[PDB]
Amino acid sequence: KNANQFEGNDRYEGYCVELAAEIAKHVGYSYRLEIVSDGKYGARDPDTKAWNGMVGELVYGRADVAVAPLTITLVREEVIDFSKPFMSLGISIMIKKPGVFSF
Amino acid sequence: DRGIQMLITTVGAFAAFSLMTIAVGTDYWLYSRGVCREEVMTHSGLWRTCCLEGAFRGVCKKIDHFPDTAEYLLRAVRASSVFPILSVTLLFFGGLCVAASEFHRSRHSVILSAGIFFVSAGLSNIIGIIVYISANAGSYSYGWSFYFGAFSFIIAEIVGVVAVHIYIEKHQQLRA
Amino acid sequence: TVERESAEDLAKQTEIAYGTLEAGSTKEFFRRSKIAVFEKMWTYMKSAEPSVFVRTTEEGMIRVRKSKGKYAYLLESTMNEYIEQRKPCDTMKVGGNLDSKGY
Amino acid sequence: LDPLAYEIWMCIVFAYIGVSVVLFLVSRFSPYEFGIFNSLWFSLGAFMQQGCDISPRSLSGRIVGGVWWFFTLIIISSYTANLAAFLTVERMESAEDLAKQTEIAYGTLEAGSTKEFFRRSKIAVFEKMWTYMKSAEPSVFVRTTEEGMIRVRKSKGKYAYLLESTMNEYIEQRKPCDTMKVGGNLDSKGY
Amino acid sequence: GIFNSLWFSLGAFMQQGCDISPRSLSGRIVGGVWWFFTLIIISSYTANLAAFLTVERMESAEDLAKQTEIAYGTLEAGSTKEFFRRSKIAVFEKMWTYMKSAE
Amino acid sequence: LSLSNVAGVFYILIGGLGLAMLVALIEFCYKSR
User: Fold this and answer.
1) Which residues lie in coiled coils (chain E)?
2) Are the C-beta atoms of residues F5 and A100 closer than 8 Å to each other?
């Protein structure tokens, strides 16, 4: 909130931000948090066979790590490496949780 | 029993006006689980709601009535409380007619207007009760102010019935 | 009295439209599913008009909030839980998780 | 009285008094025996759909009877309809059933084999049960079987205790035997 | 008199009206509560009949399977028991898990 | 059933009582002239 007052890698906040900080500390590397340009998690269009989003950014070499909520899937495991899961989850359904003269 | 009949009417007219005018002024119509400014037991009247226990005890706020004609008109009526206030004015005029009836015996139609004023005042209060309950819904209990208003309805109707009885007796003995 | 929970409740009705995020693991999970319920759900979602899919989780959240309970969003349980906690929190997770995975 | 809310019953009496007074008022000072007492009798009879020995004769008096009849017809049909709905819904369970609902809280013994079974389980129903149990507040877990038994007995059917079938069967036979084993066994094991 | 009181009360309970009505305050109080008693009882008779005639009008028990006290079994040491034991179909797996544990 | 469900039938009943009182005053003035 009011990111204009802050600048650099410390422009963002969130679970994966602190997780990237802790991983960087443990592995011993410096990093620059780039947001994916497509704004997509990742998928290969069956026609072009092209990966987009974070998975595409990782495969083509433009990025070296992805610390987003990226689901571990079989198709992605065939093109990129995943670490042990750092969070569990499942597909879930959400819902967006008498007039007069009605007699 | 004409003396006691008028005594019942004037005593009832004052009590009906007294009991209802307190209900509008006081703030104990409903005992709901609300908030004054965390959620705390609160007592809400027609205009202001106040906490009943805790640190912010006694801190009252104006009831915010507003957050499509069917429900806009319902809350607009409940916002200004036209019906509960209207019945107070009708009760006030009815009391004036009863008092002026003894101060001027020339016309017997004055006491008839007091009966119509009080009978009409009761009807306006029922609409105030129905409108307030309906708008409230859109765990709770009603306080003494709400029961003060309901008791003012019974008194107003009974005084209205007796006021017409005096007029009927007054005209029947002249014609017969 | 007719005015007197599960995966089937969504698959079975057609009055509430349910969508997913585009280019996401959930869309890909539904596309390449072979389970009867999930295949039925995918066949409906692929040929639904207007597009049930959305571009971002915020888009689906606002769609359920502004569809007045005529939209059921299929998203990951963690995001669903986080949204259902933050104000105005007029959304709710229904039923269990359709599968189990991790980031 | 449940088929109608307590507010509706109060306003029915208030409407009854209003109609009786208004019918008496417009029947007396009109050209062409509806006294105050007679008006209350006729209004009472109309609400119970029993009829009376008199009917209003003036147009002003007949309007009051006409609307009061309409109010009575809608309310009596509303009472019969809501009572039927109330009775028919009442006429219309196991592990899955316990997992799907949230009105009844269910717990286990702390530091017991059952807690360990639920913690390390990978079956959908039991994983869901564990996710609920770990987060539940106040703690659904107990320190002793007696504690769980008392909790089910004093929760008035709002607490379901998950325990071993042997202790369950023994307890369900003990006085006052106000507990009941529901459904089958979630697994099979031995001491 | 005694005979007309019996006729009036029976007429009041049947909601069929009456040739006469009480004219005293004491008689009208008796007529009043008897009228109210008649209204609640007949409404109760009509409302409960409905339910009976509704709750009734309303691989099924083998869809979810039995679902219900409709316990279902097989012959011991037969091909049907072996078929259920080694089954992998959702319905049949559910049936076997129930049949093996049921007591 | 709450009052909000059958609040409409109460307005008609009070509206009818108000109209009936108005008609009597009209009839009284016409019959008194």
Assistant:
1) none
2) no
**Under 8 Å between Cβ of D16 and F10:** no
Q: Do chains B and C touch (3 or more CB pairs under 8 A)?
A: no
**In contact, D58 and D31? CB cutoff 8 Å:** yes
Residue B126 to residue D15, Cβ atoms within 8 A: yes
Tokens of B60: 């009252």
Closest CA to E32 of D18, D44, D53: D44
Whether residue D67 lies within 8 A of chain B, CB to CB, comes out as: no
Count CA atoms within 13 Å of residue E37 on its CB side.
10
Cis-peptide into D31, omega within 30 deg: no
CB atoms < 10 A from the CB of F31, how many?
Answer: 10
Residue-range definition of the domain harbouring residue B120: 2-175
Q: What is the distance in angstroms between the Cα of D137 and the nearest Cα belonging to chain E?
A: 32
The number of domains in chain B is 1
Residue of E nearest to D185 (CA): E101
Structure token digits, residue E31: 């007529």
CATH of the domain at B77: 1.20.140.150
Binding annotation of E for L-glutamate: 79-80
- Contacts of C among chains (3+ CB pairs under 8 A): A, D
Specify burial of residue C89 (Cβ count, 10 A radius: 0-12, 13-18, 19+).
exposed
Chains that touch D (3 or more CB pairs under 8 A): B, C, E, F
| Pair type for strands D159-161 and D105-107 | parallel
User: What does this entry list as its resolution, in Å?
Assistant: 3.4
In whole angstroms, how far apart are CA B111 and each of B39, B157, F3?
Answer: 51, 15, 36
